[PDB]
Amino acid sequence: QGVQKIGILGAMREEITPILELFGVDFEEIPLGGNVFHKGVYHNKEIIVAYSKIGKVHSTLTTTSMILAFGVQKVLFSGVAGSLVKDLKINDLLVATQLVQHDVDLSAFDHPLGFIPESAIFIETSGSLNALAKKIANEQHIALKEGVIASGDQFVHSKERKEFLVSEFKASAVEMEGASVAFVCQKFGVPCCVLRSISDNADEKAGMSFDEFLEKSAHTSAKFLKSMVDEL
Amino acid sequence: QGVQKIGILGAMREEITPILELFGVDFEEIPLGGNVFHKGVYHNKEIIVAYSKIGKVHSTLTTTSMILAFGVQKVLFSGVAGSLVKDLKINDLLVATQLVQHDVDLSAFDHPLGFIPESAIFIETSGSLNALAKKIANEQHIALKEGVIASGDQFVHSKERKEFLVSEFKASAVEMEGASVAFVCQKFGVPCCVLRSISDNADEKAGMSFDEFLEKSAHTSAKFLKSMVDEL
Numbered sequence A, B: 001q002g003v004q005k006i007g008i009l010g011a012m013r014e015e016i017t018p019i020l021e022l023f024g025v026d027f028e029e030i031p032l033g034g035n036v037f038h039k040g041v042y043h044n045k046e047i048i049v050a051y052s053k054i055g056k057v058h059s060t061l062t063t064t065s066m067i068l069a070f071g072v073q074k075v076l077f078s079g080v081a082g083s084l085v086k087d088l089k090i091n092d093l094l095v096a097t098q099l100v101q102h103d104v105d106l107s108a109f110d111h112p113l114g115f116i117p118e119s120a121i122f123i124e125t126s127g128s129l130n131a132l133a134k135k136i137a138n139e140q141h142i143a144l145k146e147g148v149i150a151s152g153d154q155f156v157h158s159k160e161r162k163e164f165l166v167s168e169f170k171a172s173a174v175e176m177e178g179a180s181v182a183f184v185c186q187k188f189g190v191p192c193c194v195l196r197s198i199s200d201n202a203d204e205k206a207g208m209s210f211d212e213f214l215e216k217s218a219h220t221s222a223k224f225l226k227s228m229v230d231e232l
């Protein structure tokens, strides 16, 4: 019965800026493994906030550091994502129920795409945290979608790649970190929730949309993440 | 002036089997984060041996665990790889001077392939360890090549992808973990050496070659890694 330690992660500095602002507490900055961890006290909880830097290796490293070096008991991810489905519009929020590494390819050995031996195609997130997210969204009258998020080390900006992610994985959104964060948490037995707000449609205009909406979408996700932390 | 702690990593169980056999000491098995770490004493050094499981996320996690949980001061990687160049034949040994994540693509933002903001295309390994490898190889009359290794989350088995790795990155060999291991070590300031023995030619017949030569090539790499540890 110590103080609860909660890890809060984004991929980009822009994804954690609104998180730090919204919590409004003093943070100690602690450098480790190329990341800066922002350690603060919020209600009866220790919150450790960081951005990993972009992509799967960065996010895997940072999540592992949060767990081993800072002793976090839960990890909440907040950031932006590309939409793969018509009903997920710019600014909409989605919670990932499962995630996949969409760029993994061991098909030379007849493995399905996404699969690595001693693992699985789909990585689950925390049912209790996802239930909390849904409960809060319903009380606040916020549309919150749930579905599969695909993660890879490419920025997706083509109709062809979008359609593959939908056909192969039944994914709803695409990003570059969720699956790796969720994977690390699964390996250590740490509950994980991945929240994303849509910044673009993962098509030919995605780069321009992303630049336009990163701030607003990052804020939308951050505000929702704070509302979850308020109930922990 | 404690005992030197050396991390020894492979990707697959088959890559560490000969390592454990060759060191010939008693190991304590310690489970953590979905890996099993084999901790032993060899001469005046503590050796921590593990296989990460395949690919970039697995290897990033395991390397981070080795550094944070086991306090390793150096990391030596041993395993097998696909050859991209005519002069690297089955069983030949290569030490990686730089590594790249060949599947990273942020070209939508006009970044070169392999590049992520706040990082670099090429990750360096330890010059002092690579010099040690070359010195030992020369004394033992072992051909040891050096060059760039490309790492990604795909098993490469096509002429077309091989040629891309050579054209884009001037890579000599391909695998799925070196760049991520070397990256983590760079972030923590830990010296890293990546050794690989060729198992296949990364072409249409690579899967069959890999299955045939994994054992022999893994042993070749392991034997050389042991010879390095003998000089540390």
Ligand SMILES: C#CCCCSC[C@H]1CN(Cc2c[nH]c3c(N)ncnc23)C[C@@H]1O
Pocket: A011, A012, A053, A054, A055, A080, A081, A082, A154, A155, A156, A157, A174, A175, A176, A177, A199, A200, A201, A202, A203, A206, A210, B106, B109, B117
């Ligand atoms: C800085 C800079 C330019 C490179 C930004 S890469 C895109 C970042 C946003 N994030 C989520 C994302 C939003 N739209 C996406 C898309 N269309 N494809 C992949 N990921 C995303 C992944 C990564 O951290």
Ligand SMILES: C#CCCCSC[C@H]1CN(Cc2c[nH]c3c(N)ncnc23)C[C@@H]1O
Pocket: A106, A109, A117, B011, B012, B053, B054, B055, B080, B081, B082, B154, B155, B156, B157, B174, B175, B176, B177, B199, B200, B201, B202, B203, B206, B210
């Ligand atoms: C078990 C099993 C079947 C899947 C094995 S994936 C290949 C493993 C060997 N390793 C190195 C490698 C050897 N030949 C390769 C190739 N042709 N492409 C990518 N990696 C490799 C990467 C990964 O750990």
